[PDB]
């Protein structure tokens, strides 16, 4: 409900501290979660240049994009 | 900050919540291995326990919500 932010965080947490769309596809592909190759490249595009832990260390929820209503 | 393990389990659950798909220890483990970021295994267990009913926002509390010591 917050999009590929979390996948980005995962990749950056234990593989690559600057994840990309392909890394997202990777992470979600492993559990069979579908992803649009622009949507994640976009989330990453936003995410790129942030300190993952510190981001989520006060943001286990509403990761980057807060649920879009309407 | 947290422990990247705990936080990793967090995120595995996060991706799981993006499709809101089934939550199993092996599911979270699959995320863990996919990214390459490992967790304190009791977390994947307890996560799979709770996240089938609770919300990821509960992880921010992690039945403690402590700051200093």
Curated annotation (Swiss-Prot), chain A:
Locate the N6-acetyllysine modifications and list their residues: 22
Residues that the record marks as modified (Phosphoserine) are: 18, 20
Q: Tell me which residues bear N6-succinyllysine.
A: 22
What biological-process GO terms show up in the record? cytoplasmic translation; cytoplasmic translational elongation; translation
Tell me which residues bear N-acetylmethionine.
2
An annotated GO cellular component of this protein is: cytoplasm
Give start-end ranges for the coiled-coil region(s).
Answer: none
Could you tell me the keywords of this UniProt record?
Answer: Acetylation, Phosphoprotein, Ribonucleoprotein, Ribosomal protein
Q: How does it assemble?
A: Heterodimer with P1 at the lateral ribosomal stalk of the large ribosomal subunit.
Q: What is this protein called?
A: Large ribosomal subunit protein P2
Q: Which organism is it from?
A: Homo sapiens (Human)
Question: What gene does this protein come from?
Answer: RPLP2
Curated annotation (Swiss-Prot), chain B:
Record-level GO BP terms: cytoplasmic translation; translation; translational elongation
> What are the annotated GO cellular component locations?
cytoplasm; cytosol; cytosolic large ribosomal subunit; cytosolic ribosome; focal adhesion
The alphabetized UniProt keywords are: Acetylation, Isopeptide bond, Phosphoprotein, Ribonucleoprotein, Ribosomal protein, Ubl conjugation
Q: Which residues carry this modification: N-acetylalanine?
A: 2
Question: Which Gene Ontology terms cover its molecular function?
Answer: protein kinase activator activity; ribonucleoprotein complex binding; structural constituent of ribosome
Q: Which family does it belong to?
A: Belongs to the eukaryotic ribosomal protein P1/P2 family.
Oligomeric and partner information: Heterodimer with RPLP2 at the lateral ribosomal stalk of the large ribosomal subunit.
What is this protein's function per UniProt? Plays an important role in the elongation step of protein synthesis.
**What is the recorded name of this protein?**
Large ribosomal subunit protein P1
Q: Which organism is it from?
A: Homo sapiens
What gene, per UniProt, encodes this protein?
RPLP1
Q: Which residues of the full protein are shown?
A: 1 to 69 of 114
